[PDB]
Ligand binder design. Structure first.
Ligand SMILES: CCCCCCCCCCCCCC(=O)SCCNC(=O)CCNC(=O)[C@H](O)C(C)(C)COP(=O)(O)OP(=O)(O)OC[C@H]1O[C@@H](n2cnc3c(N)ncnc32)[C@H](O)[C@@H]1OP(=O)(O)O
Ligand SMILES: CCN(C)c1nc(N(C)C2CCN(C)CC2)nc2ccc(S(=O)(=O)Nc3c(C)nn(C)c3C)cc12
Ligand SMILES: [Mg+2]
Length: 411
């Protein structure tokens, strides 16, 4: 039933997943020298291309492929429209490996047909707390602890095949070539997320959304006026009042993050992320890159009191193309990124995120139920969406975990 995934080192079923007791590799141990030197064979009318992500033209080519051919909703109404500036940010973090960005071009005209991207991440991915307890009960602690140390692996994103080339088995070719390029650098695990169900997630979470501009969301059919709003004389006025927010932040000590904040933000974030079973480890350079504000891309605020940063939050922008609406062309969404609260309840910190996003022209705030995101859903009027995000590893056995044990945000 899976002609490609049946051949790969991933858990093949839930049954098998349910029996996994320790973190560790699935495949035969290999070395760089075992891996083919030459790119995987491809049809003579195509060619491999490694884009230069500091070439504006190269970024633009990737941008147009994704604009026209990347993830849609299930009803042909919206398609993500990651910006060029976003793509440069996401695909070029500190110590990125240019060779991990893999494209296929039509040899004739250099038309971009397919793309997949890999970036480095340092991930805690050892045996989860609940399974370490089971291991102690069996006298198997050392086994359970073997892969505790953070590992330098690959994060995969932006897999895309042009609509005219779908269902021709090009995606497997891309995945095999990205795998080869990663393994040639002595890395043997990857982490990736997808909405679709593949063999086999180690975690899954629902999406949640919080309306910031209900008038617009209703006009574009992101939202409807919910049935209960009918018994009302005037549905929309009531809807706007429900989702109204303050014009200005409520925490007095809130301001935008600046470079001098990097060490303190690193400390409070890393202390917080320690409480989750799977999560990233960031250097100062990686905190700088992923969290310092960038116009139109990522937005980060700290709470500072007595000259100390005590809390922070970040969000990033992914707009979508609205297909066929005579009033609007774009949906402007804000996505909850990393945060840490030490001084105030998390709901009070994230209310200021909603206030800031609204004041900056965002239409909706999205998130997945990872981290402690469930703790502020009801008070802050988030609603569950139809969608789910599934978390996967390549070449890593891992026990099933709850999404509230996951701390990796994927863009
Ligand atoms: C150590 C390093 C390891 C590095 C790699 C780690 C693995 C990374 C894995 C990638 C993580 C990506 C994370 C993201 O970016 S998830 C976002 C994926 N992108 C989209 O949904 C954009 C819109 N769709 C498309 O561009 C295409 O439909 C894609 C490219 C998705 C499939 O193209 P197409 O529809 O033309 O099909 P095919 O004939 O070429 O290929 C059919 C085979 O592809 C398997 N398939 C379908 N969708 C996915 C999917 N989302 N991940 C993995 N596999 C997928 C499918 O089960 C089948 O295999 P099998 O069922 O027959 O066995
Ligand atoms: C995983 C697929 N998926 C369900 C969603 N993916 C992403 N991404 C950023 C994707 C992008 C591709 N890849 C990284 C996974 C992350 N944002 C979303 C935001 C909201 C929701 S929903 O609220 O449940 N309904 C909805 C909306 C409001 N737009 N669309 C289109 C849907 C279905 C879903 C998603
Ligand atoms: Mg194909």
């Amino acid at each position: 039933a899976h002609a490609f995934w049946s051949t790969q080192p991933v858990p093949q079923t839930e049954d098998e997943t349910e029996k996994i007791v320790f973190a560790g590799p699935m495949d035969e141990p290999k070395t760089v020298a075992d891996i083919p030197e030459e790119p995987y064979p491809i049809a003579s009318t195509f060619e491999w291309w490694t884009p230069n992500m500091e070439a504006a033209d190269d970024i633009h080519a990737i941008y147009e492929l994704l604009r026209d051919n990347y993830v849609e909703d299930d009803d042909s109404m919206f398609r993500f429209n990651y910006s060029e500036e976003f793509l440069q940010w996401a695909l070029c973090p500190p110590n990125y490996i240019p060779d991990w960005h893999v494209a296929v071009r039509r040899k004739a005209d250099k038309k971009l047909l397919a793309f997949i991207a890999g970036v480095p991440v340092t991930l805690r991915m050892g045996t989860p707390k609940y399974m370490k307890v089971k291991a102690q009960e069996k006298g198997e602690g050392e086994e359970a602890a073997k892969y505790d140390e953070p590992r330098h692996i690959c994060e995969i994103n932006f897999l895309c095949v042009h609509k005219q080339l779908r269902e021709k088995r090009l995606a497997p070719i891309l995945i095999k070539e990205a795998t080869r390029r990663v393994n040639r650098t002595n890395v043997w695990q990857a982490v990736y997320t997808a909405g679709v169900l593949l063999p086999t997630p180690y975690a899954s979470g629902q999406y949640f959304h919080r309306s910031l501009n209900p008038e617009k969301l209703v006009e574009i059919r992101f939202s409807g006026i919910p049935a209960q709003y009918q018994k009302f004389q005037n549905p929309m006025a009531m809807l706007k009042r429900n989702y109204q927010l303050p014009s200005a932040p409520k925490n007095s000590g809130l301001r935008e993050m600046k470079p001098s904040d990097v060490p303190q933000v690193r400390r409070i974030l890393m202390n917080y992320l320690d409480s989750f079973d799977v999560g990233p480890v960031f250097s100062d350079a990686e905190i700088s890159h992923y969290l310092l504000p960038r116009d139109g891309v990522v937005f980060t605020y700290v709470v500072e009191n007595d000259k100390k940063v005590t809390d922070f939050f970040s969000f990033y922008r992914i707009p979508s193309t609205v297909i066929g609406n005579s009033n609007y062309n774009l949906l402007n969404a804000a996505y909850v990124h990393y945060y840490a609260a030490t001084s105030i309840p998390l709901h009070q910190l994230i209310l200021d995120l909603l206030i800031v996003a609204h004041s900056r022209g965002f239409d909706v705030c999205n998130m997945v139920e990872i981290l402690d995101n469930r703790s502020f859903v009801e008070q802050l009027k988030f609603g569950a969406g139809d969608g789910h995000l599934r978390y996967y590893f390549y070449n890593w056995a891992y026990p099933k975990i709850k999404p509230s044990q996951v701390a990796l945000v994927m863009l």
